[PDB]
């Protein structure tokens, strides 16, 4: 019963930086992640615009920036929702391990960017259709998937169409992508077969 | 390993739903076949996982249907299976026209069954051939 309009208003005014509360969580960690988190956002954004422009026909594409930023605003809003949630579920305030994991932040961000770019599909060479974002970030399908269900429970403002799109990406990971030879899954299966 | 169990759990639900969809339209005459096929299907994902490598879930699915029918003498042509599959909303022709064989070689889903599938599973598929009832694998709950 959600409309595209509300999430659009939320992201439009949301901040590009971690909130006071999110930093609160960064400072509660055995190892402080605020540093790697900011730097990662800086570099990926640099890589993302160049790639976007390249995939999009050719030249200079002022639209790549506007999207990445919306991605980041969602990324942070979702990370803080997940943390608040975990805190009331396990009653601990640390989380150092989760928040220092490169893959976790890599997956959250991608997922968040996949949603933002989805809404603006009706906006050559080829662009974003779901798998694209993976290659752009050098992120495996099996890792992305690990972030999907939580992302859906952390963001109460997702449309029906957006959850639907997220599920379709998940089904494609499960049907083949997570089974490619480059997939961490086979190690996860071997590690378990012993 | 939450990651690995979440993954399998969901891959089973998806797989079963698609299997149940095809079996209800293709094998209504023999309602018993679905549970045996699902058993072979699950056995594969769980124990012959190398078979999925660079391959598609639906290719193993249609190959299990075609298999058990064979040992139970139920007449089910692959051409009939393909046509139905095409009706599923996510279905892409390429999934049964271009399937991996050895290294970089692709051919129809038939060459796959006969050249790779049947061989890796021949031994096991035989169990079900025994005129004795099998240890059917548990169906994915999937309520709600």
């Amino acid at each position: 019963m959600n409309t595209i309009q509300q999430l659009m208003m939320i992201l439009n005014s949301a901040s590009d930086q971690p909130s006071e509360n999110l930093i609160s969580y960064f400072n509660n960690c055995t190892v402080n992640p605020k540093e790697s988190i900011l730097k990662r956002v800086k570099d990926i954004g640099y890589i993302f615009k160049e790639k976007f422009a390249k995939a999009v026909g050719q030249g200079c594409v002022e639209i790549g920036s506007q999207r990445y930023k919306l991605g980041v605003r969602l990324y942070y809003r979702v990370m803080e929702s997940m943390l608040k949630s975990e805190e009331e579920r396990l009653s601990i305030q640390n989380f150092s391990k989760l928040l220092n994991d490169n893959i976790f932040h890599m997956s959250l961000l991608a997922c968040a960017l996949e949603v933002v770019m989805a809404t603006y599909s009706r906006s050559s060479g080829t662009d974003l259709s779901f798998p694209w974002i993976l290659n752009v970030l050098n992120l495996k399908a099996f890792d992305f998937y690990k972030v999907i269900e939580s992302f859906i429970k952390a963001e109460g403002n997702l449309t029906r169409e957006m959850i639907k799109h997220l599920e379709r990406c998940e089904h494609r990971i499960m049907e083949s992508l997570a089974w490619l030879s480059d997939s961490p899954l086979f190690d996860l299966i071997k590690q378990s077969k012993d | 390993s939450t990651s690995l169990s979440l993954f399998y759990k969901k891959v089973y639900r998806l797989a079963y739903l698609r299997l149940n969809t095809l079996c209800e339209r293709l094998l209504s005459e023999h309602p018993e076949l679905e549970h045996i096929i699902w058993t072979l299907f699950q056995h594969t994902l769980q124990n012959e996982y190398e078979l999925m490598r660079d391959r598609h879930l639906d290719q193993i699915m249609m190959c299990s249907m075609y298999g058990i029918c064979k040992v139970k003498n139920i007449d089910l042509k692959f051409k009939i299976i393909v046509t139905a599959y095409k009706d599923l909303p996510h279905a892409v022709q390429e999934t049964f026209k271009r399937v991996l064989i050895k290294e970089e070689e692709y051919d129809s889903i038939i060459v796959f069954y006969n050249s790779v599938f049947m061989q890796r599973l021949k031994t096991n598929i035989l169990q079900y051939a025994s005129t004795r009832p099998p240890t059917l694998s548990p169906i994915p709950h999937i309520p709600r």
Binding site: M82, I103, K146 | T2, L6, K10, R144
Partner: peptide, 18 residues
Amino acid sequence: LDYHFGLEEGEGIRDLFD
């Protein structure tokens, strides 16, 4: 709804990377 949530109450995003 109509989406399959496979996580159980005793499970959370933190166990997925744990």
